[PDB]
Design a protein around this ligand. Structure first.
Ligand SMILES: [Cl-]
Ligand SMILES: [Cl-]
Lengths: 278, 291
């Protein structure tokens, strides 16, 4: 399959190599076995699928706006990182000039491209995703978020916050396990061996609590917010004894405490969405 | 019927009665006791033997599983049975402190009982299900000799030889759970909010999130040797990048009215690491800034 990569930076060059490794006829172009052309006009003309990874959405428009007429009948997969509004604006512009627009985000570094274990998230034209999915598989596992092009930007930000939340609880537990004391002086590798098994149950919690959020009904069942707050105060006590100062226990008891004061102690953790949202 | 291994459960609260049922369902000759009568339920009809005294329950099995309200109650029940427990295996799944676990273990060693201190990483309805964890620490002889029976409750993991480890592990794993779930709630509120690419349901985001947690699990496994080595190479995701992308999350959350305190925590923690000159280092370098 013919595919054009616009932008051969660290990530861009990784994407072009993934297409070549997967047996695609690849044309490349950079602002600074692949067939490199000297102009973006030539690159766009060489393929019906044009993948874009530029530094900013401003760079995307500076390169693509002069090519407004050349893009009719083509598919534009824009993996550039940017805001939800810029993804929507580029989607509308592409729709104006007759191009199928898929906005995407790469959920790994340049060295993760080509490996099918890393995710790339796309949102926008469904005909583009379905028609291009086999080619996009060269870069990693493709997921279709839906029809709104701006979804990929929001998802990346929301998934990074989930990652940092996980990693901050992990680092807190690592220091907790490493501190001197009875049952302490455990290495981070030993703790993480158990932690990664435990993450299967944490994933079950998230799967259990998402319908709670959507329904506005948060049955506490066997793990009420009373018990969360109860055990969070033990974590804060243990952390103060073992010298672990991460700010997490203060965030958690204050959040649950506000929900308890509101009278929702008999609810599940998902009720706490009402206390971080507007 | 019930010709499997003989096991006693002390304590018939919701969790203890769940443990007894799981032993029965696996076919074990199960003797049960509770500090107050009438809390056996359908256990005796399911094949268990309820006895009136803890001394009688202890003498009925070479494996004694303990699940009471507190370690105070543990000590009150076990203290009079010092000689009765000599030569037996005591598996104490009561929730408590590392010191109480250690006090109980040292008492057990004093009187000739093999002691495993454990924690159950689920609720009573999770006992006997799939992939739910029970963590044990203490006597390796007890773990290896009792493992086949303990599998009736859930997936057992041997944490090591220090009996107090299980208590510390439970507290550390809960913090990891709350950190994950608070970042999840943050993403839920971020995704559901108005705006381009928004108004996404929590269920839709979570299906994507549960795929993403495989990569997040790789980050933890990658960073754990960093902490143990004291060497935090940033590679292609440095603390500089973390901090810069955290500011986008902070501004995006501010726009969409998501107020979790997570973004301020992350930028503050990474900010001190960069000010100290470790911006090129990995996320694992931050362990020195909470230690
Ligand atoms: Cl670039
Ligand atoms: Cl009790």
């Amino acid at each position: 399959a013919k595919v054009t990569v616009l932008g051969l930076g660290p990530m861009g060059a990784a994407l072009a190599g993934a297409f070549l490794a997967a047996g695609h006829r690849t044309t490349v172009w950079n602002r600074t076995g692949a067939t490199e052309v000297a102009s973006a006009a030539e690159a766009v003309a060489a393929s019906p699928l044009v993948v874009v990874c530029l530094a900013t959405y401003e760079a995307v428009h500076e390169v693509l706006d002069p090519l407004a007429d050349e893009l009719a009948g083509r598919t534009v997969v824009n993996l550039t990182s940017g805001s939800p509004v810029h993804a929507r604006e580029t989607a509308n512009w592409a729709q104006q000039h007759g191009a199928e627009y898929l906005d995407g985000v790469i959920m790994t570094t340049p060295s993760g491209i080509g490996k099918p274990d890393y995710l790339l998230l796309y949102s926008g034209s469904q005909a583009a995703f379905d028609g291009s999915r086999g080619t996009l598989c060269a870069l990693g596992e493709p997921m279709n978020l839906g029809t709104d092009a701006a979804m990929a930007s929001v998802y990346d930000t929301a998934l990074l916050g989930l990652m940092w939340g996980t990693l901050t609880g992990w680092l807190h537990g690592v220091a907790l396990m490493g501190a001197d004391g009875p049952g302490g002086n455990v290495t981070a590798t030993a703790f993480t061996e158990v932690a990664n098994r435990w993450m299967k149950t944490v994933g079950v919690f998230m799967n259990t609590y998402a319908p709670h959020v959507d329904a506005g009904h948060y049955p506490g069942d066997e793990f009420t917010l009373h018990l969360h707050h109860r055990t969070m105060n033990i974590l804060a006590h243990a952390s103060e004894l073992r010298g672990v100062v991460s700010g997490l226990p203060e965030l958690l008891t204050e959040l649950t405490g506000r929900a308890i004061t509101a009278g929702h102690g008999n609810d599940s953790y998902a009720r706490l969405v009402e206390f971080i949202r507007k």
